[PDB]
Design a protein around this nucleic acid. Structure first.
Ligand SMILES: Nc1ccn([C@H]2CC[C@@H](COP(=O)(O)OP(=O)(O)OP(=O)(O)O)O2)c(=O)n1
Ligand SMILES: [Mg+2]
Lengths: 545, 388
DNA sequence: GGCGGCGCCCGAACAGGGACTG
DNA sequence: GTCCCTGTTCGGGCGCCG
């Protein structure tokens, strides 16, 4: 039936007008399905026969539904959508089973032909015109950009009084999918379910009996809900011989979907396989690291996994582990070996970075994801020494902070692989470095002058001033012993190196990092260029030619 | 009602709501039920295409939560110089009064907000304001007439007390002694129901090392600092000190300061003691406030409008310390200073990654307003230059 | 082959700052 | 000014849900 709720006032954008688009030819199957649907909808008041006074049209078509022998009528409303006012979406996100608390009794309801039970603004119906090889919509259509928001809000309004007088019953509301949980006995629960279904009826919403689940395991939002466990509906990865960009996109999307409950999923190398591509049909040969990463993911997926349900009275604990190459896995649990859920973080921020930075980024991702699913920050267990963190917190010139955390020594550990000195080292040879690069010819020079009288200048091709300053620092590091003072004229290089990086997109910064690690003491100092200072003056005169 | 339009060619705010903890959400639901019953807000739908993020803060030692709407975007699209010079200035919340004046009907759509739900159990519940929203830069503007009417007799009978309205609260200033001041503020509170000491706010200068043994490194550092400084005080000379480094020496080598060089250093210290030349406040341009983390819970800041023309410089000083919390207390102190001095909040350049600040800043926010901010990666030379 | 929500990942477009030319 | 480097944003693939 049609809901008696008020309709949402809806307008076109100013100066705009309805769509006039011809009707594509559909197969005999789609035409039969569409006439069988439309005759009944017009009988029911959901569409109205229209005539020459409606100068509008939009193409319709059909697709087989979820898995059933039933059909879905869609309208390619792209035009009308480009010409319809903006909406504010109310679906702020997707619910997750890990945020569900254990309930004694549980049922999942579906609403039948959902959109088609919510009415449509009377002034707006004309624009929804269509034809079959001519009706207009009186209810929410599928393909119109405003239907999801108007439906979700209408269903919120309908459920409002029931919730208001049934606070002990949880109704998780994804668009027309209702999860209903209670601590009532099966009998009282099924009676309250009946009250709910009658309520939805008074507001025009049928809950079909075929789509009514009453017994575990419930299929819900992509998962299987058991009384004490939840699992993910089976994830089947493609086993292609040759791979195309679209195929790796499907693969990595399915691995990302798995990463919520399968621990240790990694996509770094499969993701790299998409760097330079230009076509969803282009073929990509796997690397060897791609082979290994995908094999590992498959061997993970071949194992039986499950999550559990939240207990608000216990503590949320999030525990993080370092994978290779800026990738991280985490597990959120409450009791030692029984995960609420799992996840991964592998977002590569910054040209140069260290593990302490990535670990912080991961901690705040987990924090926001947990605020969403439970409304609570977790207690963290990180592979980083309180001393490492305190050292970094002290010597790092930006504000950084991590919530309550405790240390676990499941390696690999998070370490600052080197520490710049605060004061210059007595007796250590003192290196004044510099570099220059001709902007026209891309030629350059880099080198050092020391206090003991050592000089060096290497010539470089196809470089830039920044690259050549870093080359100078690298020169000093190579030709010095375990303790060295270095004086540079570039804030760029100084600023990279004081961040204490342990990885870099640049090969030169990687080589510099290896040299810094080898050293026992390094002291880096900055002088203003072109000022006639110290040895800066002579190395500057030396690398210009 | 007072009709309100927007700045021309601008459209209403469309800012997504951010996550809220369970206790903030619970307070927001309680507060918005009470506010809807009293007609101050009304449930709306998705056909209002506008949105503004909402959250809640806790009262100092009280257990009442305050609803805080972040109207920075809506404000973007819509003062006595003697206040700085008073002995005591008290900040006094008056935003509640704005809930008596209705809001222009055609404009109420721009105030919409969306309360979220844990785990997305329900779509967000949208509301709009029907009365003057607190946090909006239009509420004190409209309510100015009624406030002037309210304070006419108090201002008359207390001609030496300075009252300045900024968005949701009054700033009441006097040269009185703390006891008399407290009494008069209570007089004003009782009358209106129909702390800070800005004379002690001083300028944190730029200071140079004083020491009796200088090394090549120390003098290189000093020359770098003075070089960066001459871009502010153009009378700073470095010639002699820079001469003291001729050659290629070890950083640890001691370098005795010559008479000429020591005279250069003394005259440089004197120069730094002078006020900056040619810094005029422009009330059309926006205030920039830059912050540097100096470690040990010590923060430096500079308020300016054009580079090197600093209007104010200062410090914030405060075991189990929280960097983010110290930073939000810092920006709140700097903003209160700017609202006393210039009647205008600054645009902050925060030395923090956007995600850390955005996760945690609301946990520590205490004031009704919210300033503009950008996030920046500080060049370490600047922290080096403004440090103490 | 239509829509909205959230997720990931990559690249294009842009902003901003430091260093440099004659 | 130009060039070089770095960071953020946004949109377009795909995934998942209805
Ligand atoms: N591919 C899809 C699937 C769903 N929906 C929208 C239309 C209303 C709701 C449909 O959910 P279904 O589970 O398909 O239910 P239905 O349309 O009400 O039909 P049924 O009677 O089979 O539940 O979400 C959509 O726009 N596009
Ligand atoms: Mg349905």
């Amino acid at each position: 039936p049609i809901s008696p709720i008020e309709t949402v006032p809806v307008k076109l954008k100013p100066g705009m007008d309805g769509p006039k688009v011809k009707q594509w030819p559909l197969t005999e199957e789609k035409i039969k399905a569409l006439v069988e649907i439309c005759t009944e909808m017009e009988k029911e008041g959901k569409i109205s026969k229209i005539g020459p006074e409606n100068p509008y049209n939009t193409p319709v078509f059909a697709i087989k539904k979820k898995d059933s022998t039933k059909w879905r009528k869609l309208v390619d409303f792209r035009e009308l959508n480009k010409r319809t006012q903006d909406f504010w979406e109310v679906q702020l996100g997707i619910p997750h089973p890990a945020g569900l608390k254990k309930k004694k009794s549980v049922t999942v309801l579906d609403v039948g032909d959902a959109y088609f039970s919510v009415p449509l603004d009377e002034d707006f119906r004309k624009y929804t015109a269509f034809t079959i090889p001519r009706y207009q919509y009186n209810v929410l259509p599928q393909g119109w950009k405003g239907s999801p928001a108007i439906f979700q809000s209408s269903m919120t309004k309908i459920l409002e009084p029931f919730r208001k007088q049934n606070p002990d019953i949880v109704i998780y509301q994804y668009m027309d999918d209702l999860y209903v949980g209670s601590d009532l006995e099966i009998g009282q629960h099924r009676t309250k379910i009946e009250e709910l279904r009658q309520h939805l009826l008074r507001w025009g919403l049928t809950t079909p009996d075929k789509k009514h689940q009453k017994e575990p395991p419930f299929l819900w939002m992509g998962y299987e809900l058991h009384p004490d466990k939840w699992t993910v509906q089976p994830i089947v990865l493609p086993e292609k011989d040759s791979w195309t960009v679209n195929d790796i996109c499907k693969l990595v999307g399915k691995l990302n979907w798995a990463s919520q409950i399968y621990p240790g999923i990694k996509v770094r190398q499969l993701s790299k396989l998409l760097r330079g591509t230009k076509a969803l049909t282009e073929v990509i040969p796997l690397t060897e690291e791609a082979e290994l990463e995908l094999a590992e993911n498959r061997e993970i997926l071949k194992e039986p996994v499950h999550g559990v349900y939240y207990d608000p009275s216990k503590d949320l604990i999030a525990e993080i582990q370092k994978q290779g190459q800026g990738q991280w896995t985490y597990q959120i649990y409450q009791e030692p070996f029984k995960n609420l859920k799992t996840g991964k973080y592998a977002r590569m921020r910054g040209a140069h970075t260290n593990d302490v930075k990535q670990l912080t980024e991961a901690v705040q991702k987990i924090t926001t994801e947990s605020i969403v699913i439970w409304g609570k920050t977790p207690k963290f267990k990180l592979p980083i020494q309180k001393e490492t963190w305190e050292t970094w917190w002290t010597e790092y010139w930006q504000a950084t902070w991590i919530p309550e955390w405790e240390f676990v020594n499941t390696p690999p550990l998070v370490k600052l692989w080197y520490q710049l000195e605060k004061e210059p080292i007595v007796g250590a040879e003192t290196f004044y470095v510099d570099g220059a690069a001709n902007r026209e010819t891309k030629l350059g020079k880099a080198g050092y002058v020391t206090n003991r009288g050592r000089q060096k200048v290497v010539t470089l091709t196809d470089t830039t001033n920044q690259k050549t300053e870093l080359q100078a620092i690298y020169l000093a590091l190579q030709d010095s012993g375990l303790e060295v003072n270095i004086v540079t004229d570039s804030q760029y290089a100084l600023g990279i190196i004081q961040a204490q990086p342990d990885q870099s997109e640049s090969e030169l910064v990687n080589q510099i990092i290896e040299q810094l690690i080898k050293k026992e003491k390094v002291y880096l100092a900055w002088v203003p260029a072109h000022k006639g200072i110290g040895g800066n003056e002579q190395v500057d005169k030396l690398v210009s030619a | 009602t007072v009709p309100v339009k927007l700045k021309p060619g601008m459209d209403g705010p469309k800012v997504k709501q951010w996550p809220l903890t369970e206790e903030k959400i619970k307070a927001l639901v309680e507060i918005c039920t009470e506010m809807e019953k009293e007609g101050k807000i009304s449930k709306i739908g998705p056909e209002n295409p506008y949105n503004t993020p909402v959250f809640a803060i806790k009262k100092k030692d009280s257990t009442k939560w305050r609803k805080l709407v972040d109207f920075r975007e809506l404000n973007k699209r819509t003062h006595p110089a003697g206040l700085k010079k008073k002995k005591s200035v008290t900040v006094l919340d008056v935003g509640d009064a704005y809930f008596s004046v209705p809001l222009d009907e055609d404009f109420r759509k721009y105030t919409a907000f969306t309360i979220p739900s844990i785990n997305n159990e329900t779509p967000g519940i949208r509301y709009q304001y029907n009365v003057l929203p607190q946090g909006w830069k239009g509420s004190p503007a409209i309510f100015q007439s009624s406030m002037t009417k309210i304070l006419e007799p108090f201002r008359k009978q207390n001609p030496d007390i300075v009252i300045y309205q900024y968005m949701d609260d009054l700033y009441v200033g006097s040269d009185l002694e703390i006891g008399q001041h407290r009494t008069k503020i209570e007089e004003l509170r009782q009358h209106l129901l129909r702390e800070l000491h800005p004379d002690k706010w001083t300028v944190q200068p730029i200071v140079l090392p004083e020491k009796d043994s200088w090394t090549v490194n120390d003098i290189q550092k000093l020359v770098g600092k003075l070089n960066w400084a001459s871009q502010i005080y153009p009378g700073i000379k470095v010639r002699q000190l820079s001469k003291l480094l001729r050659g290629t020496k070890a950083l640890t080598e001691v370098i005795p300061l010559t008479e000429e060089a020591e005279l250069e250093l003394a005259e440089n210290r004197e120069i730094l003691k002078e006020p900056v030349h040619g810094v005029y406040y422009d009330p059309s341009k926006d205030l920039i406030a830059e912050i540097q983390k100096q470690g040990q819970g010590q923060w430096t800041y500079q308020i300016y409008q054009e580079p090197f023309k600093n209007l104010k410089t200062g410090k914030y000083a405060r075991a189990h310390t929280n960097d983010v919390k110290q930073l939000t207390e810092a920006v709140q102190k700097i903003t209160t200073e700017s609202i006393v001095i210039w009647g205008k909040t600054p645009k902050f350049k925060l030395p923090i990654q956007k995600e850390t600040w955005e996760t945690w800043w609301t946990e520590y926010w205490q004031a009704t307003w919210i300033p503009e901010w950008e996030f920046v990666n500080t060049p370490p030379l600047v922290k080096l230059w403004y440090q103490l």
